[PDB]
Amino acid sequence: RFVFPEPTADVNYIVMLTCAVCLVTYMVMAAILHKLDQLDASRGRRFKYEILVKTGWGRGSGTTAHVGIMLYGVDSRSGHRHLDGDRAFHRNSLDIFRIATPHSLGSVWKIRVWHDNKGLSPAWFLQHVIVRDLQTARSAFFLVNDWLSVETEANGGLAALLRFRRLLVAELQRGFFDKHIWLSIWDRPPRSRFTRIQRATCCVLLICLFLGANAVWYGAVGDSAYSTGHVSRLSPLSVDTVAVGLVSSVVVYPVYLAILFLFRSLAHGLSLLLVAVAVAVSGWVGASFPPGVSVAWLLSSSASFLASFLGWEPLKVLLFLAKEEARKVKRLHGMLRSLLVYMLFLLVTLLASYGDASCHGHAYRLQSAIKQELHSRAFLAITRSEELWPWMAHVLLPYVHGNQSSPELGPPRLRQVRLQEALYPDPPGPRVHTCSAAGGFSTSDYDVGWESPHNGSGTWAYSAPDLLGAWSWGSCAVYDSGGYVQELGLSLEESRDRLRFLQLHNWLDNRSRAVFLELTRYSPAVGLHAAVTLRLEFPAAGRALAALSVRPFALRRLSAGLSLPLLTSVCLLLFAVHFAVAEARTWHREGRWRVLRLGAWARWLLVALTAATALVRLAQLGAADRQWTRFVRGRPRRFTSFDQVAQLSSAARGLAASLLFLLLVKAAQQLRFVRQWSVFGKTLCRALPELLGVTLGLVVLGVAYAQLAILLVSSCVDSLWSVAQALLVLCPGTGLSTLCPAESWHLSPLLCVGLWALRLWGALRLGAVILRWRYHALRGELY
Amino acid sequence: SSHWGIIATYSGAGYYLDLSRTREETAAQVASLKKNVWLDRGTRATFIDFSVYNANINLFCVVRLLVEFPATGGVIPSWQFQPLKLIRYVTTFDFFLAACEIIFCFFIFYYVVEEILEIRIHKLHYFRSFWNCLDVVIVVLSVVAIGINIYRTSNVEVLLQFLEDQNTFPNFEHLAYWQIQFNNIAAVTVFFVWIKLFKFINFNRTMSQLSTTMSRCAKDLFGFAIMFFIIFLAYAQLAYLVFGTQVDDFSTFQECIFTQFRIILGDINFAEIEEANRVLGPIYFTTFVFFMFFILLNMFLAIINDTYSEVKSDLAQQKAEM
Amino acid sequence: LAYLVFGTQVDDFSTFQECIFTQFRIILGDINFAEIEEANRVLGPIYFTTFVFFMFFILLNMFLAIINDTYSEVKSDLAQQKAEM
Amino acid sequence: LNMFLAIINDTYSEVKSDLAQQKAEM
Amino acid sequence: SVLRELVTYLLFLIVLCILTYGMMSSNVYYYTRMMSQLFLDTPVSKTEKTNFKTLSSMEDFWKFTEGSLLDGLYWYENLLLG
């Protein structure tokens, strides 16, 4: 019933990323927990008011011992205590004094106090440790003066009471969260041998065991019905995903129980080896996973963890400095919960971005091949509007009907824009035209040749633009999806006849705003589609400039079911809503005048980025589904372009990359919590205006020098004079168009600025002059 | 055996053909292969192997040419020329090299014995020095090199089989592979042996204070280098995700890292990075250059200068006040 | 190390003095890096990246730090000598 | 080329110290 | 009084910037480059692959004089000044 997995596929990143994230968060949480434990290992071992908290009238009703008081409340309780002074627990001593106990209980009848039976049974008559109102009045001044048996827990409110209605209910708040290990890493009471690191090891052991067992069950057990594709769909059937996680948790429960009972040493190494081998097994089995069973494995692991957290552990239990230590431990707990939330967000983002990194290598080779077998050089090097037809008749046509790899998936199309405003040739001039002479765009219908409507509508109709998918963008303007269309034919022989008919019937010479040839390709070996777009723009009659775009993408459809992109998108929406509501609450707690300081501007950016990523991914899925449904209906009748899907996929990938970059930067700046490593970032914050001033001065100096150079260079042709001597201090060889060509100079001047900063990088060393000084000041005061 | 080409790792099996000794026979064979079509759409890799001797010097040469046909279309060529020496003992210099080899073996044995003897008796921790991890690294590398040499020079049976029948293809690829591995290991070992010289350059107050400064600032440099590398990898992954499918220089993560390191040197061409993306293209380059040259490069100088200043000042104060 | 690794394919490391000159030219950033990538896919890029990191970030700043400290100390000593007549 | 930076750094330190000491009593 | 003497300097600077824009956008560089290519880069005669920029002998100069020089000199179109 067990099958050795085969070395199929190449590799799976989902399981590896999940295991790496779990190990990293475990290591960071272990570091934090050790920092807290060493703080509360040797040390740390409104309820109190100004009422008579002692009763010293007893005669022979005391002994040298201690006492304790346990109370419950709304997510708050108390514990034992031991205090003494100079009287050394005098007989019936009236000690009306309270220490900074953690007894943050409420105004409820939940309290039980008892002393130590040092010697014989004491029948002392002590009223109570009365407390009425000091800061919040969490108790009531109601003393009963009731006595119990020897060291027996005296009843109280706000000597043989041994019944399961009360004896067992004591553990409902005493050992409740002391053993619910998942929600107990920050509930460790003193006088216990837990160390708060054994809990972390047990938790990471449980997580790794769940992951490994689920990976084994999906990737090795396939002898019943192969447990894949037949009925175990990736979509939740409600009887398979839970039915494997619950069973996995039940089977793996005893090995965790053994280690827990051993703890309750050398078990650290045993648990480390066990989690290491489990992770290795999960990674080895991970290679044999199609995406559907991969998301099924993710959901099964989540279900098993939830079942362990909520189903088994709750039923497992049924078998000077003091005013700042509390603040520091509260800060540590906040750090822990924020770290857990951030690691969950980082895992979701990593799965959203690098979910399919195998196609990222194949897409590059596919687009390179499509360019090299389309003769991109021969297309980008055409300027007139009469070599288009020979280029198509010689290159493209043998590529469409030329049966080879990368099948066609739909006939090509040629759509033209008329502009109705026939252009005039211009004098040679410096060219570099922005083709602004365009006016309106033609919309009427025309017959064969051009305008001559005899009977009804023209044979060359406008074919009004589609609502979704347009705006190729270009030098002249931003186009759309409309234009006069020609289908170029189906067979190779008739295609040549159509091409020559368009040649000799006055089609492209006169008006011709654009040509807009477009294609699509399919690669089933890697399962990738490709959108190919070829465009020639005619700024003036007899002149053209070329553009080529090959966009490889993957056709992910919304109707496919519970895809990984869908899950990542819904998780990102949930995270964005959580961040937005938290920020809105915190902002409302301060009202107006919060727009000051970057603190409130780093949250809106994150929320907007997350929302944009999720919405763009959802839009891409919907557009892909709509386009596929449109295309499937009739193949040899329509083009059904896929450019919008490619653009949406590119935008979603860019947004995910930007979000991951921001998360990595945030992780980088959270390294300050080491005492000696907190200086660095601090200096970067304390020396910022100096860097701004240096940058402004350098920009002004560069502007002055650039003006000097531009005025000097544009004088005449080579004469070997002093002007070129002074201008030769830059741009390699007494002038190289400021090191970026003029055609590239009127294209994103920020890039040229960056290039010139890179070339003259010795000026930036001036910044060091500032930074060093600051580092000598900030570091000199911490000591 | 396997090859580990560029697209993937290729097996040692397939459909092979041994060519002939004369040109006419080989031409006829290749023409017959081309006529009855041999490279169809199903082909994925092609290998050509041969070898030459060049008897003037004593040095064989093994030539292997590989052509990869990816499933997405195209052709990727690669080559591998390797010079070997399998008839070592010919001249006097060969005997001198053999003597040096056995001397090296004796030296390695001596170092191993010293290491074991010193680790056994005292200093059972032994790893808080950084001058003992270098010793174990050097010993391990030299032992691995000696083992590879022993397993490589004694497995020259293929030469004996070839020399008794010179009308058959000689298999020299394993020897070339192990020669490359031995060369890499020897280069790393000699580099580390040279680095080990820093233990002995302490003969005056000028050299002692520089070593003290370096050892004292190593910790802070590592602490800041963690953040530096986190930012570096963030930029690398952003570039890989955005430009990775169009630029031919961000196609792989390691290629992105190397491209960034070349950008530091000023060895970048802006045309391709810009035409791949009108927006987010210039932003990436400009922000990377600015935050790498104006901030990260100067913080290292700040740390190093502060450490050197404090070290020099405290030695000077201690010496002048004793 | 570069001589022993690339000393038979790259003709910038074909001789020891040529290796030294190529290493000096690497600092100026006028080396292709295309040949040394294909000469050895592993341990080739490692050498380049490690060399760049240790030259630009650890050894230039040390020269600058030494010069800074010495110049400041000299100015302080000269000012004390001149202002205490 | 590393000696211009020494002069600039030293002058910056002197100017900052002078401004800090002048501001203390004013 | 600094603010008053600021606006005059900014007005002077903007006037100088307008003059600079007028100077640099005179589009004279294109004409010089075009006619330089017309006279220099043009081969002497199509039978010989040589031009003025790569002259090597006295006979090459003689070919250039009765050749590319006489072609470009007597033809966008230029008018001789004597």
Ligand SMILES: CCCCCCCC(=O)OC[C@H](COP(=O)([O-])O)OC(=O)CCCCCCC
């Ligand atoms: C204004 C001309 C700036 C061009 C500097 C030359 C470019 C350059 O690479 O020199 C930077 C230099 C560090 O040495 P290096 O970078 O040349 O290897 O660092 C320096 O020596 C900085 C000195 C410049 C400071 C003077 C500014 C008034």
